[PDB]
Amino acid sequence: RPECVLNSDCPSNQACVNQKCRDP
């Protein structure tokens, strides 16, 4: 059960790192 998938998946055009949102 990952927290993130696609980069755009999160807000502020964040990035997907380690199956979880993060900074680009």
XYZ file of N, CA and C in Angstrom, residues 12-24:
39
model
N 1.351 20.791 -5.490
C 2.528 21.621 -5.729
C 3.487 20.953 -6.708
N 2.937 20.170 -7.630
C 3.746 19.477 -8.625
C 4.870 18.688 -7.961
N 4.635 18.258 -6.725
C 5.628 17.489 -5.981
C 6.111 16.295 -6.794
N 6.956 15.469 -6.186
C 7.489 14.293 -6.863
C 7.206 13.023 -6.068
N 7.283 11.880 -6.741
C 7.039 10.594 -6.097
C 8.357 9.917 -5.733
N 8.610 9.783 -4.435
C 9.838 9.160 -3.957
C 9.541 8.058 -2.946
N 10.093 6.875 -3.189
C 9.885 5.742 -2.296
C 8.396 5.506 -2.062
N 7.677 5.182 -3.135
C 6.238 4.927 -3.058
C 5.538 5.950 -2.165
N 6.060 7.173 -2.155
C 5.486 8.243 -1.347
C 5.883 9.610 -1.898
N 4.965 10.568 -1.818
C 5.223 11.913 -2.309
C 6.529 12.455 -1.738
N 7.078 13.478 -2.386
C 8.330 14.077 -1.940
C 8.687 15.293 -2.786
N 9.907 15.788 -2.609
C 10.377 16.947 -3.357
C 11.092 16.510 -4.635
N 10.792 17.163 -5.771
C 11.413 16.830 -7.057
C 12.936 16.867 -6.991
